Amino acid sequence: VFDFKVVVTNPNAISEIEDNKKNELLQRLQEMITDTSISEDEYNIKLEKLN
């Protein structure tokens, strides 16, 4: 058998320095969508891609 998956060793262990990095990336992902979306047409769609 051959399944070699990258897995989280402790998946229920979320800390502060993991959480402050995820909020930083979603701030970057929010920053991108204000530039790419022609306003009011696909801005709701990309939000449904990142809700």
Binding site: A13, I14, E16
Partner: protein
């Protein structure tokens, strides 16, 4: 990264110098803890049906690797739903009473 928020603050409450077998925690691979693990997932599968444990909770049980965290999730999700059913019984009781009013 490998520990949680509450798990990293244990280092502050004192005495962590002392071995874990002094505080009641032992490393055990024996037939007692595999029987307790096989009971605690069979109990969760019997609690997945009859709508007692959500599908959010059971996937946390499969990715827990400790018999006391997965014990507390069965306890936590039963207290939440039995609180919700007791208030749903209460709001349905007063609704017919205000209809009676």
């Amino acid at each position: 990264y490998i520990l949680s928020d509450t798990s990293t603050r244990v280092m502050e409450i004192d005495g962590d110098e002392f071995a874990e077998a002094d505080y009641g925690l032992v490393v055990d691979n024996s037939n007692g803890t595999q029987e307790l693990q096989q009971k605690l997932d069979t109990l969760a599968q019997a609690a997945l049906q009859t709508q007692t444990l959500s599908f959010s909770t059971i996937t946390k049980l499969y990715t827990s690797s400790s018999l006391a965290e997965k014990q507390r999730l069965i306890e936590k999700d039963e207290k939440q739903i039995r609180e919700r059913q007791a208030q749903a019984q209460k709001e349905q009781l007063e609704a017919q009473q205000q209809i009676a009013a």
